[PDB]
Amino acid sequence: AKLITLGEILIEFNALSPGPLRHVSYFEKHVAGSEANYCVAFIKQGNECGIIAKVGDDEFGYNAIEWLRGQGVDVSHMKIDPSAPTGIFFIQRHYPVPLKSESIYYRKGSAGSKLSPEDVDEEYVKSADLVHSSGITLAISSTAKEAVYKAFEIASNRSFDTNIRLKLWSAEEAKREILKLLSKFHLKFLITDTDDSKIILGESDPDKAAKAFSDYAEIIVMKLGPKGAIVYYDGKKYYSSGYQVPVEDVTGAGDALGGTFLSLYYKGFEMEKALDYAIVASTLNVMIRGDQENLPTTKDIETFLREMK
Amino acid sequence: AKLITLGEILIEFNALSPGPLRHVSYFEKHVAGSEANYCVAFIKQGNECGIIAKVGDDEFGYNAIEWLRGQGVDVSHMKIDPSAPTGIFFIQRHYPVPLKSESIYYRKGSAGSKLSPEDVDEEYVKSADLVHSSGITLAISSTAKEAVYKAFEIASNRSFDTNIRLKLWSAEEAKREILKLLSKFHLKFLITDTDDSKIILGESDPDKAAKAFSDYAEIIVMKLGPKGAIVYYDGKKYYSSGYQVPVEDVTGAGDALGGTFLSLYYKGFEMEKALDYAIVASTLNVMIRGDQENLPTTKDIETFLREMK
Amino acid sequence: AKLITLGEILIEFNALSPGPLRHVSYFEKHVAGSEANYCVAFIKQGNECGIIAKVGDDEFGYNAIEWLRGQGVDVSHMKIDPSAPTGIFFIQRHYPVPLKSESIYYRKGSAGSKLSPEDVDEEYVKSADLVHSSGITLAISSTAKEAVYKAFEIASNRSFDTNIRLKLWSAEEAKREILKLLSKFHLKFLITDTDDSKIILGESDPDKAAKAFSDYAEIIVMKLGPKGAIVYYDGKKYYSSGYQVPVEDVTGAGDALGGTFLSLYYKGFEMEKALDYAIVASTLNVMIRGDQENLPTTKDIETFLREMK
Amino acid sequence: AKLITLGEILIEFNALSPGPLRHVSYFEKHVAGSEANYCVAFIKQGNECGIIAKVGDDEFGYNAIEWLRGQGVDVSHMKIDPSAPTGIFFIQRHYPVPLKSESIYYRKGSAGSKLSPEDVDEEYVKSADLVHSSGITLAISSTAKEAVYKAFEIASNRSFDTNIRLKLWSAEEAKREILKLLSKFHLKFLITDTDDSKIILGESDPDKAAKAFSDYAEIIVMKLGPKGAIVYYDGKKYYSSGYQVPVEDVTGAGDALGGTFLSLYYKGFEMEKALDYAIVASTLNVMIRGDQENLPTTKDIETFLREMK
Amino acid sequence: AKLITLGEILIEFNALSPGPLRHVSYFEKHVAGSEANYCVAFIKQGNECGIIAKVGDDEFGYNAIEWLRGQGVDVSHMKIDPSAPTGIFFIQRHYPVPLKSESIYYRKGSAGSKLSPEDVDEEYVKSADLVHSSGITLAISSTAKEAVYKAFEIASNRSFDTNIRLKLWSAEEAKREILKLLSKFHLKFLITDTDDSKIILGESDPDKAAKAFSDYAEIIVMKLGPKGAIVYYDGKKYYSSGYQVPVEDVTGAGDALGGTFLSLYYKGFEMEKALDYAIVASTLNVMIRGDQENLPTTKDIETFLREMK
Amino acid sequence: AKLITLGEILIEFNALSPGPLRHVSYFEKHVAGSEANYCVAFIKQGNECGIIAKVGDDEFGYNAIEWLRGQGVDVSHMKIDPSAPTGIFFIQRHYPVPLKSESIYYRKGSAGSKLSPEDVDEEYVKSADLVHSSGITLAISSTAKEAVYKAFEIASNRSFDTNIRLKLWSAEEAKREILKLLSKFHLKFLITDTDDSKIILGESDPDKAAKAFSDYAEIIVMKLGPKGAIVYYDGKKYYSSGYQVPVEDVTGAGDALGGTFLSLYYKGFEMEKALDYAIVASTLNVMIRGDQENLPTTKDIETFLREMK
């Protein structure tokens, strides 16, 4: 299968030590951004992927292209805006909450945020089995939001990560926009969590929220963080629990869940097995800085699973 | 409220890896000393603080001054001494006991040890609401010990952290010297732990030690380790339990606890909350190399508590 | 002497290796920004200084206050904007030009640039012997350019570093605005260079630009970069040559010069001995990453001269 | 008491970060190899040790010699082969299986594989109390295997560590060759585990495998990795359990246990106390990169033990 | 234009610090190998390239593929061998000769050494403006040498860098094979240096060596280390000097000259602009660890040139 | 031959970056100390050596022993002291003077300073062809001074590096003591420099000072830093110039020359050659942090000499 994703790629500056940023002296660079992550997770399971995105005529942008290309992502459909810098973020790890991570953005008016419909090729999208985006991409700009609308009307199959970031728009904003998005545009996949449901429908509880989402999506994945995840499908529910593992950095783990789950689905795996394998991509992510350098491979996941009894 | 502490500021050279020091290659520098940790912990709750301390006319002395200034500490009452070096110590982490840390001192005849009564100024000393010192200060030199006597016979309110180090003096001597101190000055706060209590009283039971201690101290803090703390005020007893958190280096945590506790008391939190809040501080502290770089603001503490329900 | 400078404190992520950032993995954090570097250069020669600046209500904002309070700079008239972030930048080093350094700005619409006339309280300002700002301050925004206009009109005595950054505005914008500033407001001190001089006047000979500028300034410093500096006062001319010294990061170094020089003037120093010294401060800057960590004490500059014979 | 071992020493290149080697940019160097490791654990309990091994005439070889010689190991019977390089390997830690490390060998044709009977002097071996080797030595090459044969026909007492490595030879081969070696050559000591027991004996039960092994060996030690170990000797059996501790790098833990155990037996420890003690050498190992730098002294082990009641 | 090179890609382990490897604890990983370097430097000038090589089916192998695909190199024609590992080497720097670097190999029977005629295919090679290889490829093994021969007899025009490595073969072994290969096959380009010329022809002086070599090739590039390079397009003779510049790691330097030079030729550049441009690429290289991270694009060479006035 | 040195080993903590120690974050552990340096330089040429020194019963002392054992130094005649800690010092680099390095001591009352006569043994000391030491050993205490004097009465051939250190004793003190030491004990070798001659003789001219020194030493070595050194023997003066070379850390370089020059003498080398080689030892040293790790071998020195044409 072919997955196409659209959204803003980001250069990440990962705090080399935990604690408040004002006391961190070193930052380690990684290529990230949810949709970029989804891509790599997807390819790593044996499939094919592209990204529609804009980066700057800057080292950071050219860094994003080389990195993705190496990973094997089709990038020929990306754009280089010369009037805008690539958007970047900084991760503060384990402070003020242990085990947790916080992102500090420099992306307003980024080249990523200038992703517009004119960048979305009609013939190209029409070739993907799956067109995927997220609440981040809705949030960043109205050009980008329209971009997601264009690629969704063209689509045939759609997947969405609600992926609400309150630093990017009010609970309020996020609610109507996601709700709006789901009026038109029925979804093949819908990836979310307890929190986004608390926003979108004010409904903290998993199976409830899932029943409220399921007129708009065939499959729902509840990310549950440390405790794992739940897949809802065919009027059935399967919970797949967590593993206990050193936590270096939580950022990227949601994507590792999603990208991997989508890809193994398209490799034929029964839903229980797909979520299960993806839970291991998630567990592996948690234990390094970098959203993408720990993403495993169907062989790697299997290894992980065999030696865990 | 204004706090005034007297003691030795030290420069810390923290093993960049666990293991016996003869195979550690890299050392990371931090500013510390229990009283200085107290200071910053304290100001991180919006009260004021100063320190009476001597450092050398050397780069490390100035490190100490720059760091603490940065932090908003009152350093204008510090002494610079051309005749002696600033005190330093190395930290051997997690070897030969996992979780534990060990100090290796190079402080004999330091600038800090030549802290004397002529340094403690009566007009500065009255004008604190709290004057605080520790057993390390009673131990490092007879002039420093005389300094604590002077500062206490002016103070009106006092706080002493027993803080016994068998590397600086015998269990025996320390009992004798702490009992003598407690004899001649009544305390508003006593901060200690199960270990110092066995050394002073023959009692390791917090409740039983708290009874023996309470003739000399109005509020008592029984640091219980990873198990947490218990405060004893006006007949009541309140145990507040610890947290499981990765441990990088405990050096510092005790002080983070004491200093936050004292500050939140002046801010107006009832004892139970003050202890709760102090535990998070000591809890966070443990997770990094360095005694002060991790100390939480009152807001930062609340973020911790909310995200733990 | 008191100096008050009016500017944007930036946060610096210095590339740990030379080369295009896209292949540089580690960035090292520093507090910087022209006016910031002038303050601490000024203080190190035993004079006093303060800064009018706006920061974000974020980890970097506090980074800059902590650092500068740390260095003895008055930070009690810095403002905090809860609505915009602290301005940052990256340095690319020796690529594609040996010895040279590039700044990559994430500072459009930062807190730092919301610096406004309303942040310049006159009671504080007329307390200064000398009010300094730069072209950086003019270029960043209108509101910040106006803050210079205000401050400069309360100011009895005035200092200006042209410090034209072509990434921030166009050569013609520079030329109009620096001229327009120099129309109102006469200057005790003008700091600039050959290249800024071509952009401004059309004159790149040190003397001819000097003579043309000597209408608007009592004392003029021409930064020559590697070859040193020249000073022009009272129809005299003095050239002090630079030092051959290994280059790590050239950024910070003109600031090292002007700040040192300004301070030495106020100490009683010959104009020529004040330049000689400021030169050494300049050359020391170039050997490390970070604009400020290498700024010399007067006694320190004296050791350098003594040792060079 | 003199221990002589016979094996290949390897230079270790340990990943500085978990994760697949293809996204790891730094490797930390250490001296290791099973018998080298045994050597140090043996000496750290206050007995003497020598090693018969062959290194390249290169930087890595001299690295082996220098390190061991600093440790106190007799290196006067090592060999420097100029036509083959010192063998090395890479450790990938925690990927794709958490808490586990994987060795990636670059050792075929190495100086270390060119160990031969000509390299083992009869007068040397004769004055050892214990001659020890492993199935690694046995598996690297014919010449190295043959050396173990020459040594063991000289040795009055023998020790052996099954240490099966599947990347070095097939399970069937390992089974044949270790069986061949245990019939002829009665062992004072067999160090092994549950995994090797399965390969050699069909049996994975510790009790039934020990039973199967007692025809060959007087004392038997069953490593249980994290669960502790069992020692079997004259009808007795004794299980000593393990410790919950952070895991940096599990490689080398096994040698730490066998070597500490052998050494304390000659210090006249009772078998139960010897294992108890050795489990702590094992557990300390796990906590760092490096097979040898953590190796506890008898004193250090007692500290660990006393500070755990 | 389309370039196809063939030979061994390597993973390079750069000593993080100068000095003998025995005393260096950290190693930086880079992707290297001559023909791989040429590849990137080439595509950098806006041309197309491919590489025929065989890597291990291991982490180090995919590290290679991922890197080179990222750089834009066509990798679809690379082969993966599971019976052998990817070749690697370590770089010792500035010891015992300053400014020089020393490569220590572990490549024997590597998967790259198992390049064979069967891997190079007619169609791919017949569709290429230049086929390039090197003496390292002739020297790693016969199947590899055989590979060059197959590829040369298909190639329109051929390019070859003598690149004599003495750790790989003897002097007389080099002389015979380069001459043997040059006796069949007219090269379009012959890149070599003074040293290699004394081995192949007898002749230390470049002017005599190029005359000697005009009996085999159209254009001859004489690398002259830091003195620069000479290019002999016959009749004429273009020397371009080097640039004094801090030297981190000289390895990769000559490759950078080679690859940049051949590319700019294919873009219309008069011989002397090409060597000048190629010199800056070679001189930018010398100044980082890594053979390919500093390879400049054409604009980047131009910037270097505008700014050196 | 055999060299016995008599002095203080010290652990050295080398600033990982240049600049004032108060802004440096990391230190790199190194084993150092003048006499210990001489030993390793000496052994590098193929001679024996031992050190008579005293260290603490600590990690750091044990660090000193292990390291020197590895290097091949006879340490059987060292002592360990329960009452005192191993001396240590810090290096500050290139600040405030480029190229130069400053040492910051923590050595008063160190185990090392408690070196005394009874530690120097007669049979041991007369099994050497040369007995060596320095001003550092004379300054550190009465007892170590005393011990030099006893080594020297025992010895027939003796060596003295004047090695004046002004943070250790006043100038008038060094003159007095060095001169009263030369007042008995004619010496085989006097190793000094130009500075040490202003202090001791009042004489900065190498020729004039060697003539003043000639009635006290058969052979005189005058170190010229980067200029080189002069050896004075049998009425002949040979000047040997130095090399341009990146400077990282000068400390260690004097000893590299001394130790290397001594060793080669005993190795038979013609004097000029012996001093030629010493220069390269002393010139390699300077380009790394760490007094010992760069110490060249004879073969290594000749590689330097060959590959400088």
Side-chain angles (χ1 to χ4, degrees), chain B residues 89-157:
Chain B
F89 71 109
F90 297 77
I91 309 175
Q92 176 157 117
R93 299 186 308 103
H94 310 170
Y95 179 95
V97 190
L99 317 170
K100 273 260 203 74
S101 265
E102 270 171 12
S103 287
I104 293 103
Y105 294 108
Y106 277 83
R107 69 192 310 166
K108 212 54 150 293
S110 66
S113 72
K114 309 227 311 242
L115 198 250
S116 82
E118 295 75 85
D119 290 341
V120 13
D121 164 280
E122 126 153 8
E123 219 182 73
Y124 188 46
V125 169
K126 55 196 183 179
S127 78
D129 318 273
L130 223 221
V131 178
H132 165 94
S133 182
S134 76
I136 300 156
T137 308
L138 260 45
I140 63 171
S141 85
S142 112
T143 65
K145 173 218 276 118
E146 295 170 316
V148 175
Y149 281 67
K150 179 153 184 237
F152 271 20
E153 81 226 347
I154 286 149
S156 62
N157 294 283

Side-chain angles (χ1 to χ4, degrees), chain E residues 1-207 209-308:
Chain E
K2 254 171 169 258
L3 169 65
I4 289 183
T5 78
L6 42 163
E8 163 141 45
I9 293 152
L10 303 140
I11 298 328
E12 176 197 271
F13 288 95
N14 218 132
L16 179 57
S17 72
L21 252 28
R22 90 182 64 181
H23 294 312
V24 167
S25 310
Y26 299 93
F27 288 80
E28 222 178 64
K29 195 195 53 182
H30 285 96
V31 172
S34 174
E35 277 84 336
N37 301 343
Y38 270 80
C39 269
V40 189
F42 199 87
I43 149 132
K44 280 260 167 207
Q45 310 322 124
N47 274 164
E48 276 161 21
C49 58
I51 180 143
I52 285 163
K54 215 179 233 180
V55 298
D57 171 45
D58 49 29
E59 284 303 309
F60 290 164
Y62 288 85
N63 199 155
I65 292 172
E66 298 183 11
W67 175 258
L68 288 161
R69 191 165 41 216
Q71 284 312 289
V73 186
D74 173 42
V75 280
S76 77
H77 286 264
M78 287 183 61
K79 287 308 154 129
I80 295 158
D81 189 2
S83 53
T86 304
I88 54 115
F89 68 121
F90 299 75
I91 305 206
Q92 175 161 126
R93 308 190 289 100
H94 318 151
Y95 188 93
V97 187
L99 319 180
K100 281 239 191 134
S101 283
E102 300 194 333
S103 288
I104 292 91
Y105 303 104
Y106 288 83
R107 59 192 314 164
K108 211 91 208 250
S110 62
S113 93
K114 285 214 221 161
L115 231 203
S116 72
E118 10 290 297
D119 317 299
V120 28
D121 228 292
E122 212 129 44
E123 208 123 26
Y124 184 54
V125 164
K126 91 161 194 187
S127 89
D129 290 294
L130 225 215
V131 190
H132 168 96
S133 178
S134 72
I136 293 154
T137 311
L138 269 42
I140 53 195
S141 93
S142 350
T143 51
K145 153 163 348 146
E146 255 140 67
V148 177
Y149 282 71
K150 170 165 169 169
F152 272 6
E153 58 219 17
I154 305 168
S156 51
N157 0 303
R158 319 131 175 71
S159 149
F160 188 87
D161 171 339
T162 62
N163 224 307
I164 282 150
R165 286 335 166 92
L166 263 7
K167 282 146 169 185
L168 256 65
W169 51 3
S170 76
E172 331 82 272
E173 211 147 29
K175 199 192 152 197
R176 172 178 65 274
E177 303 290 335
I178 288 144
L179 258 31
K180 207 162 203 225
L181 177 104
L182 303 181
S183 292
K184 282 220 109 212
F185 323 108
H186 173 66
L187 318 169
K188 184 168 185 67
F189 304 100
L190 193 242
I191 309 131
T192 167
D193 66 41
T194 242
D195 266 278
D196 283 3
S197 283
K198 170 186 134 193
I199 274 153
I200 305 137
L201 299 157
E203 250 307 60
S204 348
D205 142 63
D207 264 80
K211 203 213 165 145
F213 275 145
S214 32
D215 256 359
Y216 311 111
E218 223 224 305
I219 295 148
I220 305 169
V221 169
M222 256 295 143
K223 318 193 256 165
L224 258 319
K227 200 130 104 78
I230 306 165
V231 59
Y232 304 87
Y233 192 18
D234 286 80
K236 262 124 211 197
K237 185 180 154 183
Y238 315 65
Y239 164 68
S240 179
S241 99
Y243 294 88
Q244 201 200 238
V245 115
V247 172
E248 184 61 22
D249 188 20
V250 95
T251 131
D255 289 333
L257 191 105
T260 298
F261 176 85
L262 297 176
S263 229
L264 300 169
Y265 167 76
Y266 272 94
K267 268 227 165 172
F269 282 61
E270 281 193 41
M271 302 271 100
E272 50 177 291
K273 236 197 248 193
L275 199 55
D276 280 7
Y277 274 44
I279 283 290
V280 1
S282 165
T283 76
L284 279 186
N285 200 94
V286 148
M287 82 201 286
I288 57 147
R289 305 179 292 273
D291 298 32
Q292 289 177 218
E293 21 290 280
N294 256 18
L295 286 176
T297 64
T298 309
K299 133 139 152 242
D300 275 349
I301 292 191
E302 271 156 1
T303 304
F304 181 107
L305 292 165
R306 242 183 321 280
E307 228 112 312
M308 291 220 79

Side-chain angles (χ1 to χ4, degrees), chain B residues 45-63:
Chain B
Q45 332 296 132
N47 275 121
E48 261 151 41
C49 61
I51 222 231
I52 287 154
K54 245 190 200 130
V55 301
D57 207 17
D58 49 37
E59 284 301 297
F60 293 157
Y62 276 97
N63 205 159

Side-chain angles (χ1 to χ4, degrees), chain F residues 41-99:
Chain F
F42 202 87
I43 193 154
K44 299 251 92 170
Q45 308 318 122
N47 283 102
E48 314 211 304
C49 67
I51 193 167
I52 293 155
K54 206 188 243 160
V55 296
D57 198 1
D58 52 39
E59 275 314 305
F60 287 158
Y62 277 95
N63 192 169
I65 308 177
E66 291 185 0
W67 173 267
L68 291 165
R69 264 198 297 251
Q71 294 312 292
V73 189
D74 177 10
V75 303
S76 50
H77 287 267
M78 279 177 76
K79 301 236 172 282
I80 304 163
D81 185 348
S83 66
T86 285
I88 73 152
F89 69 116
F90 293 82
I91 296 163
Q92 187 175 122
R93 297 187 293 107
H94 312 162
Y95 191 87
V97 197
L99 268 41

Side-chain angles (χ1 to χ4, degrees), chain D residues 221-253:
Chain D
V221 181
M222 275 272 167
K223 300 157 276 170
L224 260 43
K227 322 270 188 240
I230 303 140
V231 72
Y232 304 87
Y233 70 106
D234 94 316
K236 315 309 242 286
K237 158 202 134 121
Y238 171 66
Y239 157 70
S240 180
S241 75
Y243 294 91
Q244 173 63 243
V245 113
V247 172
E248 187 68 7
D249 191 21
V250 89
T251 114

